[PDB]
From Swiss-Prot:
Localization in the cell: Cytoplasm
Domain HTH OST-type: 8-80
Species name: Homo sapiens
Coiled coil: none
Similarity annotation: Belongs to the TDRD5 family.
Protein function: Required during spermiogenesis to participate in the repression transposable elements and prevent their mobilization, which is essential for the germline integrity. Probably acts via the piRNA metabolic process, which mediates the repression of transposable elements during meiosis by forming complexes composed of piRNAs and Piwi proteins and govern the methylation and subsequent repression of transposons. Required for chromatoid body (CB) assembly.
Name listed for the protein in its UniProt record: Tudor domain-containing protein 5
Residue window of the full protein shown: 1 to 79 of 981
Disulfide bridges in this chain: none
Signal peptide range: none
Length: 80
């Protein structure tokens, strides 16, 4: 039960890190949800994990994703 949820959390964390590692200089939160659907073949599991957005998801994994700035306060997400 709780063990199954931990393995969902581990699987997504590994998927996000793998996506951000494969890029040159990170992705915007919007580019990451697009890329996740394209490369994983499923949408980010936001609703089922209690997230309203990609930002909410990535802020819940600060050991996996680094929140970096850009032009006009835009966010670029990078793997750690």
């Amino acid at each position: 039960g709780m063990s199954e949820q931990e393995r969902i959390q581990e699987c997504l964390r590994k998927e996000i890190r793998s996506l951000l590692i494969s890029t040159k200089d990170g992705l915007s939160p919007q580019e990451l949800e697009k890329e996740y659907l394209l490369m994983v073949g499923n949408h980010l599991p936001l609703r089922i994990l209690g997230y309203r957005s990609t930002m909410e998801l990535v802020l819940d994994m600060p050991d996996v994703v680094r929140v970096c700035p850009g032009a006009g306060g835009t966010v670029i997400l990078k793997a750690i």
